[PDB]
Amino acid sequence: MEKAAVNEDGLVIPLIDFSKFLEGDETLKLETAKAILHGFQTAGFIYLKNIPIQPDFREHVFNTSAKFFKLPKEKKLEVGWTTPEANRGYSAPGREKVTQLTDPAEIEKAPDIKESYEIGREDEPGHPNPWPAEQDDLVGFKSTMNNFFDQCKALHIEVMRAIAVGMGIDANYFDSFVDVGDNILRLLHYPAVKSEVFKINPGQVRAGEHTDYGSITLLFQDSRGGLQVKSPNGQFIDATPIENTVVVNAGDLLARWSNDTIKSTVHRVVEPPKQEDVHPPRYSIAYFCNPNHKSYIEAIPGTYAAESERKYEGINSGKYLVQRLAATY
Ligand SMILES: O=C(O)CCC(=O)C(=O)O
Ligand code: NI
């Protein structure tokens, strides 16, 4: 095993070689799957290295993302969300506008310093992706992003197999729960920002603390830093960027699905841990994996020894997620 990616305040996030799961004999594969699962059961986060997604293609996806966010605001808004529940296209958090009708109670006004672009699967009636015009630097944007979507789709399936192998159940247990690919590819851009912004403003952050809603999130980050994970002792710990890794974390739905054997951990993005006048732009890409909308989510076999140990009632996956997202708007 590699040295842990993070080891502080009781938070241990392992660094795991995923090729040893995909290519190993039964025994090396099992060992790797146990390490993966152990990570999810303790930190709720792992780093994976040597995944089947190529570094040059990943670099290209990041360059493609930055070309999109370099578009004028008015062009990015052209691919904004078509409705509030679309969950597809361009978004930027906005603070409420003060007007002569804003009363003293409403004056408690900071939003995430970020913008995003969300892409779902291309074969979903009622939920098409709003693609930008393929011209100048955005030629190939669609094929690049759809490609990356499908590679992340495959990686999700394989992470779930590692979880199944680690649990000692059928390797393919999750396949029929996730095969629709009801996943969201989220491109993120955190603009350049003066460090003084954070000196003046108290709890200004790049992304507010939260847990993810779904099963698994695959997080690709650049070298800027700023991602933090809450330790079991209540303190935020830097998830330092490691070249050519993917950070993988469990979401609330998997915590539940696992009967709380797996952790969904609070995390956030703050100022990078680098002292500088101006913090340059930070790019990341989160691929939110979910069970099929129609899936009924109840305790995974092996996560409870008896009926009484089942902590949660069953729920429909689609329903749960729209509930969590409706509240977000
Ligand atoms: O940008 C990051 O590193 C984390 C983003 C994140 O946690 C999210 O969008 O859910
Ligand atoms: Ni998150």
Residue numbers in the entry: 1 to 109, 114 to 333
Task: Give verbatim excerpts from the published study on this entry.
Like the TET proteins, T7H is also a Fe2+ and α-KG dependent dioxygenase. Here we report the crystal structures of N. crassa T7H (NcT7H) in apo form, in α-KG-bound form and in complexes with α-KG and T, 5hmU or 5fU. Similar to other α-KG dependent dioxygenases, NcT7H adopts a variation of double-stranded β-helix (DSBH) fold as the core. The active site of NcT7H is located at the front end (opposite to the back end) of the DSBH core and partially covered by the α10 helix at the C-terminus.
The crystal structures of the full-length NcT7H in complex with α-KG (NcT7H-AKG), and in complexes with α-KG and T (NcT7H-T), with α-KG and 5hmU (NcT7H-5hmU), and with α-KG and 5fU (NcT7H-5fU) were solved by the MR method at 2.1 Å, 2.05 Å, 2.35 Å, and 2.15 Å resolution, respectively. In all these structures, the asymmetric unit contains four NcT7H molecules, of which two molecules consist of the whole polypeptide chain and the other two have a disordered region (approximately residues 94–114) due to differed crystal packing environments. In addition, similar to the apo NcT7HΔC structure, a metal ion is bound at the active site, which is assigned as Ni2+ owing to the presence of NiCl2 in the crystallization solution and the verification of the ICP-AES analysis. Structural comparison shows that the α-KG binding does not cause significant conformational changes in the overall structure (RMSD of <1.0 Å for all Cα atoms) but induces small conformational changes at the active site. Compared to the apo NcT7HΔC structure, in the α-KG-bound NcT7H structure, the residues composing the active site and the associated β-strands move slightly towards α-KG, and the active site assumes a relatively more compact conformation. In the ligand-bound NcT7H structures, the Ni2+ retains the coordinations with the three residues and one water molecule (Wat1), but the other two water molecules are replaced by the C1-carboxylate and C2-oxo groups of α-KG. In the ligand-bound NcT7H structures, α-KG binds to a positively charged pocket with the C5-carboxylate embedded in the pocket and the C1-carboxylate oriented towards the substrate. The C5-carboxylate is stabilized by four hydrogen-bonding interactions with the side chains of Tyr194, Arg286 and Ser288. The C1-carboxylate forms a hydrogen bond with the side chain of Arg190. In the α-KG-bound NcT7H structure, the C3 atom of α-KG is about 3.6 Å away from the hydroxyl group of Tyr194.
